[PDB]
Write a protein that binds this ligand. Structure first.
Ligand SMILES: Nc1ncnc2c1ncn2[C@@H]1O[C@H](COP(=O)(O)OP(=O)(O)OP(=O)(O)O)[C@@H](O)[C@H]1O
Ligand SMILES: Nc1ncnc2c1ncn2[C@@H]1O[C@H](COP(=O)(O)OP(=O)(O)OP(=O)(O)O)[C@@H](O)[C@H]1O
Ligand SMILES: [Mg+2]
Lengths: 133, 86, 240, 54, 242, 108, 233, 66, 241, 243
């Protein structure tokens, strides 16, 4: 029924349609071709420079010292989604609250990167789902 | 499905009604026609009649019948597999 | 033939059969290596949960490759024997054709090279074993202590530990082992390796095995009595 | 039913066969099967054949 | 499940493409080629203080006139380096002359693709390609000093200076500004040690960094730790001169 | 319908759906005719040689060919040009293709 | 977006096509452009090479196969490095046994049948490279186009690679001028450089980026490079 | 009722943000520019990628803007 | 899923894939009948030539394996030629290694065993033909053995195969019910053919021209198929009765 | 469901889907006919001229086998060029062992087994080609057509490719008017007439006609190409009638 109102037997009104899936594999060839899904745009893992800008967008609320070299810990973080980077900053703030320190330091951010990637490289959603792509 | 014997009676019922230039090729057509249902023979005379509209003829030549048989058969077999009875 | 490509890269850039192999080495019993001034000491965990098990005839965790190279291991007990057979073979082959016993670094390079091979051969699963290869080169008294792993890379260490609870043992060795000054003698070193183990074994004199290897082809296994004595001393020393 | 009445022809915008690109033999064969038996219905009746149904 | 030969809808072999990301996870190798020699610099990257850092090896001699640096999963490179010494040695046995660098590199690239599922008697000696990339440096009389980057892609380019490893992106940004044809052998050493410090994740000292050169006169030489300590002290000076 | 193998035989067969008309992909020459009736609506130039573009597109549907025309104007708009040029029709064929990595000098 | 018939080469699709052979044909549309054209006395290859970045050098594109036959690749380098090695050996196998310069036409078929036997069988990546094979034998000048499907054809001129279409258009017009230029090797190279300038997406020809090769009634197969192609830009 | 997760929060200055804006935002904002050429604007976008890459994050960002 | 593509048992306990082969047999619409004479064997089968273009001579279902053994095939013709070529090789090889002619039984038993290996290996697919071998063996007299893709075979007093085999079975049974002997009795081989065609006209209802039949007869030490002229003589003998 | 993915599997019906699919790949090729004359055979194939760069009369799609068996195919052009190549071994090998040129019903049998073998394992793709091949030996002329399934039959005219409808309908009228068995010298001019008629559903991209014949009485039973004048006369004959 959905396919048939995106080509109608008539011009349909001003209607833009956005599809968001975790697998294009599943989708039927009738949904995919232009006129019903004109532009495919891939949101992929950010490269190294991406991971530098996404650290800046979570951290700007945070209190951090001046000597944080975000280039240093982006280089140390392997290929990662933007969802791991949220958990990184949360855990950096977490070790500072356990330690009784109001400001997050360089030691605390390294520990957090270590904890997130080490344990959860066992539970990475990224590896299975990248293959359906 | 009509047997090789009957299949011959069915042809003669749908080519009598329609105009023709006198058609003696039903001896060939029956032999070409396998797995034809009653329904496909009746459609076969129609396709033969539609080549008669393109040529501007007003009779079904025995040449137009040879073409029609082949045309119904190619598409039939391909696109639908008819049931196996018990 | 049977040659399926069991081991392939994932899009993250790690081989998943090799990460799985290394998790298998974690559940293994614990083996520790520390090299003193002029000895090595290999301490190993005996699973003592078992009762009515004869210790006289039961294969140990320290298997001599040559008369001056010993090997210890963590991981799958069954697969371990497969490395030790190819190693005993390689030690006599090298004696045959070049003369001179194997140097510890060469015997590792062979053993480490086998674990690497089985990560490319189609049809073969990787090994589930990490080893500590220790001993003295012939006509020398520098102790040498190496570690291989199922990636195939090998490295020398001043002290090391593989197997379960290894982070807790390694933390104790980073505080109690001065890199400049080894345990003064052979007797102090044994007292450093036992004291590290008693943190994760939660005692049991029978649980701990100690094999000491000394220069000039002197391999001896410390007996139960000796081990007990050491434990009682350390417990009494630490207790005091 | 009221849905049938909404389905009737409200006039589909003039495409013309010139704005169906290519596809010549397909157009011919459709208009043979659908168009003619409506308008040229006398030439099929004299020939004797029934009219293609769909 | 995909085979190992399969192409993507773009026309790229999956495994060979995935393999390139294994190189990104490796440690940093820097290579600057001058008209007096080539300098090879590596971050050893010890993983503990107990780990003895001298036994780690990432620079290896192929022949007195060819040296090699490794980045990626480095146990795979045990197999590549063994092939290379044979080709280089077997080739000096048949023709009484040292291989060219450009010819030696190509023989290791042919070897690289060999993955498959097996068909007839034909060897396929991997399941996935060598998960390591190499910087082959060396010198022949014909074309002076050369420096090559051989990737598991199966293609090699001759470079004036390339840097691969964890800090590849930020390292090659600094080279593009700093290199020119008029560097000498003692300026390149300090130029590798300056770039090695910007992408390094530790403190720069003599134990966990290694330098190597290749000159015609002396062959391929790995610097001892003593010489490297002097060059590390000599970097701190030129940055305080300013 | 676009799946004809699935429908059972009582819905097909002569005497119900007498004619069974197949639609082939636009052939290399038809692509030229197709691109030319969709472009009349937007601005054109004589720069464009539609003959070129028709040879490039292989196994393009009459729906994707209409996409090429639309996409090409999107790139003309992003530059800010008066009208569509030949570069943008070429550039547009690559946008309809799901290509998204180009040549990272993966290919010699 | 990845189909269901993308597994091994054995699989046919319900449309009838073989998808894995079509995927290997995309490996050509991402390589660098290369233009071949011939008269009745000279064949000419004009390839635009490709650097990786600035510090990098350029990637060879034209392989001397013998002294009267040479080919230029566009696509994967190691796939060509197997197919160019194979033609070398088959050209020696003719001079040794039959003392016959291997006719260009016969070398096309030999290559074709070597590509076919890897898309019939399970396992075996199909070769992801497109070659142009020029050469001069006893029947004159010849220029072949070899697809990774295996189909080899004889042409007066072609191109392959990225944005080849702009050059292939210039060859369809001027085909009637450059085909009659015989006994003059200079002008035939000039017509080939002009062709490949139509395909550039503003990369700009340069003396280190261009590579030309000719072969003729009297010349051996020779490749021009660096300073030697400064006269021809 | 249109939540607000502003457009700054989307990572970087990616091309991916700019390809969404040409589909949704521009034909509503400025139909002056599309009228001259005569192009009718695209309609469908397909966002696809491994989990955690911000497919949803952008959706919320265009929800208020639009 | 992968228990019904290859030949392993299903959870129920049946080799699905083999079972699917028998439905592949009746995909040509040939019917056959085969009876034991008193000193000969006769086998008739319909021969439908579809198009005018086909040359009527090459279309055939009766294959000469040896002088001793004829073979009539029911099923798709690629697998026909594949089973007939393998049969001929075994017929020759037997003669070579044991020094007499291959009996009918021994050729039948060699095919059932190759058929078995094909339902037990995974990568092999069972051939979709049913083979019937007629002969006049020298030890046992007239014989018919019918082999099938599963690899089961048995002797027969008479047999039929095809889409309308059920009709033809009822007649062949009704005859041995009344006479109470195992085989049609009439010394001459000419009159066993006349009887044969009578039961096909009944069982199928179809009247047969001389082209619609193809007749094979095994006597002592030669097996032939009858020429198109000879099948016309037979049909004049039915009309004159 | 999963019965279409693989070869040499049967569906519950009793069909090999890979083999049904291969006939759709034959269906895309160019029109190709074969006329059995009284004295021999005439093969004729429409060869599309794709562009002004393809060189004229130089891409023969008629391959000879031995000295007296013409092979012309439609479908996947490399895949046909392999099935003939294997067929040059089977012929040269028979000729070695029995020192007589291989007879045509026997050559049809060798090819048959080879194509039939490639529908028996998961490991090999079925051939995507229809062949028409024939010639003249000491028992007369024969003509065969090899389906990608592995069946073959005798024929008096055959067709394959896109124009198989119009051709097979035209070869019926050619066997009607001439029931005696038309002459070989005349059948060159009749084969031309069947390509130009079957090229009206394809009149978009012009073509170049190739004809070859093998007759006992004209060329001594050796397969040649028609070339020069008799071919330039054939084009004229067919072209004048269909005006
Ligand atoms: N042959 C053609 N010539 C011109 N335009 C075409 C052609 N084919 C398709 N188009 C364009 O593609 C658009 C979409 O086509 P359409 O909706 O008919 O697809 P469809 O074949 O009906 O798909 P479905 O499988 O859903 O039925 C049309 O509005 C038309 O503008
Ligand atoms: N590009 C990005 N920039 C900044 N933050 C991001 C980015 N991508 C993800 N995040 C963070 O990760 C969180 C989860 O992302 P989101 O809910 O968009 O997942 P998704 O992309 O829809 O994947 P899934 O739907 O599989 O969970 C967001 O709430 C946000 O905090
Ligand atoms: Mg989401």
């Amino acid at each position: 029924e959905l396919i048939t109102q995106l080509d109608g037997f008539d011009p349909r009104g001003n209607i833009k349609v956005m599809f968001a899936t975790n697998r294009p594999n599943t989708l039927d060839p009738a949904l995919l071709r232009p006129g019903r899904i004109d532009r495919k745009v891939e949101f992929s893992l950010p490269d190294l420079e991406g991971r530098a800008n996404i650290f800046r967008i979570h951290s700007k609320s945070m209190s951090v010292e001046r000597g944080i070299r975000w280039e240093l810990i982006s280089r140390l973080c392997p290929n990662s989604t933007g969802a791991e980077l949220r958990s990184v900053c949360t855990e950096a703030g977490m070790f500072a609250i356990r330690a009784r320190r109001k400001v997050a330091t360089e030691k605390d951010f390294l520990k957090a990167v270590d904890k997130v990637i080490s344990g959860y490289k066992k539970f990475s959603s990224t590896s299975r789902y990248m293959q359906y792509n | 499905l009509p047997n090789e014997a009957g299949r011959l009676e069915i042809f003669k019922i749908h080519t009598a009604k329609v105009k023709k230039t006198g058609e003696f090729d039903f001896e060939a057509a029956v032999k070409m026609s396998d797995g034809f249902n009653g329904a496909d023979i009746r459609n076969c005379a129609t396709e033969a009649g539609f080549f008669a509209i393109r040529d501007d003829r007003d009779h079904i030549n025995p040449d137009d019948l040879m073409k029609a048989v082949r045309k119904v058969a190619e598409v039939k077999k391909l696109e639908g597999t008819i049931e196996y009875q018990k | 033939g049977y040659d399926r490509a069991l081991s392939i890269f994932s899009p993250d850039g790690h081989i998943f059969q090799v990460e799985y192999a290394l998790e298998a080495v974690k559940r293994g019993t614990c083996a520790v290596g520390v090299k003193g001034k002029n000895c090595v000491v290999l301490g190993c965990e005996r699973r003592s949960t078992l009762k009515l098990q004869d210790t006289r005839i039961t294969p140990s965790k320290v298997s001599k490759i040559d008369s001056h190279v010993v090997l210890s291991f963590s991981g799958l007990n069954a697969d371990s024997r497969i490395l030790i057979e190819k190693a005993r073979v390689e030690a006599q082959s090298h004696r045959l054709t070049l003369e001179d016993p194997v140097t510890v670094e060469y015997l590792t390079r062979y053993v480490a090279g086998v674990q690497q091979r089985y990560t490319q051969s189609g049809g073969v699963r990787p090994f589930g074993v990490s080893t500590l290869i220790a001993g003295f080169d012939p006509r020398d008294d520098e102790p040498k202590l190496y570690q291989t792993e199922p990636s195939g890379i090998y490295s020398s260490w001043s002290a090391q530990t593989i197997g379960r609870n290894s982070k807790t043992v390694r933390e104790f060795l980073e505080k109690n082992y001065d890199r400049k000054e080894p345990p003064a003698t052979v007797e102090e070193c044994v007292k450093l390796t036992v004291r590290s183990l008693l943190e994760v074994v939660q005692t049991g004199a029978k649980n701990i095995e100690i094999t000491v290897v000394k220069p000039d082809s002197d391999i001896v296994a410390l007996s139960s009595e000796e081990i007990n004595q050491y434990v009682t001393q350390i417990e009494q020393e630490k207790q005091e | 039913d009221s849905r049938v009445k909404a389905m009737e022809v409200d006039e589909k915008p003039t495409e013309t066969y010139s704005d169906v690109g290519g596809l010549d033999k397909q157009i011919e064969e459709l208009v043979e099967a659908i168009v003619l038996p409506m308008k040229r219905a006398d030439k099929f009746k004299d020939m004797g054949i029934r009219a293609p149904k769909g | 499940d995909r085979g190992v030969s399969t192409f993507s809808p773009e026309g790229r072999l999956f495994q060979v493409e995935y393999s390139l990301e294994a190189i990104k996870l490796g440690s940093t190798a820097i290579g600057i080629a001058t008209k007096e020699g080539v300098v090879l610099g590596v971050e050893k990257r010890a993983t503990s203080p107990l780990l003895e850092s001298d036994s780690i090896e990432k620079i290896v001699e192929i022949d007195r006139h060819i040296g090699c640096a490794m980045s990626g999963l480095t146990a795979d490179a045990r197999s590549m380096i063994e092939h290379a010494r044979t080709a280089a040695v077997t080739h000096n046995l048949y023709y009484d002359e040292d291989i060219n660098v450009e010819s030696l590199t190509q023989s290791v690239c042919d070897l690289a693709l060999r993955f498959g599922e097996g068909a007839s008697g034909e060897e396929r000696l991997m399941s996935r390609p060598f998960g390591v990339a190499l910087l082959i440096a060396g010198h022949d009389a014909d074309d002076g000093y050369q420096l090559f980057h051989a990737e598991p892609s199966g293609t090699f380019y001759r470079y004036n200076a390339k840097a691969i490893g964890s800090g590849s992106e930020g390292a090659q940004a600094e080279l593009l500004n700093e290199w020119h044809s008029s560097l000498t052998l003692k300026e390149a050493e300090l130029l590798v040690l300056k770039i090695l410090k910007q992408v390094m994740e530790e403190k720069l000292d003599e134990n966990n960094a290694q330098l190597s050169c290749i000159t015609k006169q002396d062959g391929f030489k790995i610097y001892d730790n003593e010489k490297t300590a002097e060059l590390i002290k000599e970097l701190k000076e030129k940055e305080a001169a300013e | 319908t676009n799946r004809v193998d699935v429908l059972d035989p009582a819905l097909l067969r002569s005497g119900r759906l007498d004619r069974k008309i197949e639609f082939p992909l636009p052939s290399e020459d038809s692509r030229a005719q197709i691109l030319q009736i969709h472009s009349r609506k937007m601005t054109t130039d004589d720069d464009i040689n539609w003959q070129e573009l028709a040879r490039s597109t292989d196994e393009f549907n009459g729906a994707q060919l209409k996409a090429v025309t639309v996409e090409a104007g999107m790139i003309a708009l992003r530059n800010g040009q008066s009208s569509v040029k030949h570069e943008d029709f070429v550039e547009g064929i690559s946008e309809v293709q799901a290509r998204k990595s180009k040549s990272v000098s993966f290919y010699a | 977006f990845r189909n269901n018939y993308d597994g091994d080469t054995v699989t046919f699709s319900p449309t009838g096509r073989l998808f894995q052979v079509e995927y290997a044909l995309e490996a050509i549309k991402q390589g660098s452009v290369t233009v071949g054209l011939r008269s009745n006395t000279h064949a000419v290859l004009v390839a635009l090479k490709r650097n990786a970045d600035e510090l990098s050098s350029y990637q060879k594109k034209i392989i001397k196969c013998d002294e009267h036959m040479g080919l230029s690749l566009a696509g994967l380098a190691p796939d060509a490095r197997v197919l160019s090695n194979y033609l070398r050996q088959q050209c020696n196998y003719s001079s040794l046994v039959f003392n016959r310069k291997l006719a260009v036409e016969r070398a096309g078929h030999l290559l074709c049948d070597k590509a076919q036997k890897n898309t019939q069988s399970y396992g075996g990546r199909p070769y992801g490279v497109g070659l142009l094979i020029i050469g001069y034998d006893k029947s004159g000048a010849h220029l072949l186009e070899f697809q990774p499907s295996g189909n080899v054809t004889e042409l007066y001129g072609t191109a392959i690679g990225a944005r080849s279409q702009g050059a292939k258009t210039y060859l369809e017009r001027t085909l009637d001028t450059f085909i009659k230029i015989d006994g003059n090797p200079d002008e035939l190279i000039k017509a080939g450089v002009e062709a490949i300038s139509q395909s550039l997406r503003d990369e700009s020809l340069t003396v280190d980026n261009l590579s030309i090769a000719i072969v003729g009634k009297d010349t051996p197969f020779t490749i021009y490079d660096g300073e030697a192609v400064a006269k021809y830009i | 009722e249109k939540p607000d997760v502003t457009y700054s929060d989307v990572g970087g200055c990616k091309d991916q943000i700019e390809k969404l804006r040409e589909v949704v935002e521009l034909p509503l904002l400025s139909p002056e520019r599309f009228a001259t050429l005569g192009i009718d604007p695209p309609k469908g976008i397909l966002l696809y990628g491994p989990p955690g890459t911000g497919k949803t994050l952008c959706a919320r960002a265009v929800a208020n803007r639009t | 899923g992968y228990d019904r593509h290859i030949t392993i048992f299903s959870p129920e306990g049946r080799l699905y894939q083999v079972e699917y082969a028998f439905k592949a047999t009746n995909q040509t619409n040939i019917n056959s009948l085969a009876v034991r004479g008193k000193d000969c064997t006769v086998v008739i089968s319909q021969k439908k030539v579809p198009d005018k273009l086909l040359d009527p001579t090459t279309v055939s279902y009766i294959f000469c394996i040896s002088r001793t053994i004829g073979m009539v095939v029911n099923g798709p013709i690629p697998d026909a030629r594949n089973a007939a070529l393998r049969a001929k090789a075994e017929a020759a090889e037997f003669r070579y290694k044991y020094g007499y002619d291959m009996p009918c039984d021994v050729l039948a038993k060699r095919m059932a065993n190759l058929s078995q290996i094909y339902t037990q290996r995974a990568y092999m697919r069972p051939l979709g033909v049913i083979l019937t071998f007629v002969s006049v063996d020298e030890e046992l007299g007239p014989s018919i053995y019918k082999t099938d893709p599963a690899g089961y075979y048995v002797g027969y007093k008479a047999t039929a195969t095809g889409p309308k085999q059920q009709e033809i079975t009822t007649n062949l049974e009704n005859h041995f019910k009344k006479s109470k002997i195992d085989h049609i009795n009439e010394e001459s081989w000419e009159k066993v053919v006349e009887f044969a065609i009578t039961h096909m006209i009944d069982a199928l209802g179809t009247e047969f021209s001389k082209n619609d039949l193809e007749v094979g007869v095994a006597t002592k030490d030669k097996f032939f198929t009858l020429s198109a002229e000879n099948i016309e003589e037979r049909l004049v003998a039915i009309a004159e009765q | 469901t999963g019965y279409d993915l693989s070869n040499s599997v049967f569906s519950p019906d009793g069909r090999n889907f890979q083999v049904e699919y291969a006939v759709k790949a034959v269906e895309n090729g160019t029109t190709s006919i074969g006329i059995k004359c009284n004295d021999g055979v005439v093969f004729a194939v429409e060869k599309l001229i794709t562009s002004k760069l393809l060189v004229p009369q130089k891409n023969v799609k008629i391959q000879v086998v031995d000295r007296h068996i013409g092979c012309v195919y439609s479908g996947l052009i490399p895949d046909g060029r392999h099935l003939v190549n294997r067929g040059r071994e089977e012929a040269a090998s028979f000729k070695k062992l029995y020192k007589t040129p291989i007879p045509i019903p026997a050559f049809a049998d060798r090819l048959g087994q080879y194509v039939q073998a490639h529908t028996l394992y998961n490991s090999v793709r079925p051939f995507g080609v229809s062949t028409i091949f024939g010639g003249v030996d000491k028992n007369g002329a024969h003509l065969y057509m090899l389906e990608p399934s592995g069946s073959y039959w005798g024929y008096k005219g055959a067709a394959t490719g896109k124009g198989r409808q119009s051709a097979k309908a035209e070869l019926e009228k050619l066997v009607d008017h001439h029931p005696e068995g038309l002459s070989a010298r005349e059948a060159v001019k009749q084969a031309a007439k069947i390509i130009y008629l079957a090229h009206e559903d394809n009149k978009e991209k012009d073509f170049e006609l190739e004809i070859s014949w093998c007759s006992l009485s004209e060329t001594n039973g050796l397969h040649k190409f028609v070339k020069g004048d008799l071919l330039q006369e054939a084009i004229d004959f067919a072209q004048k009638e269909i005006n």
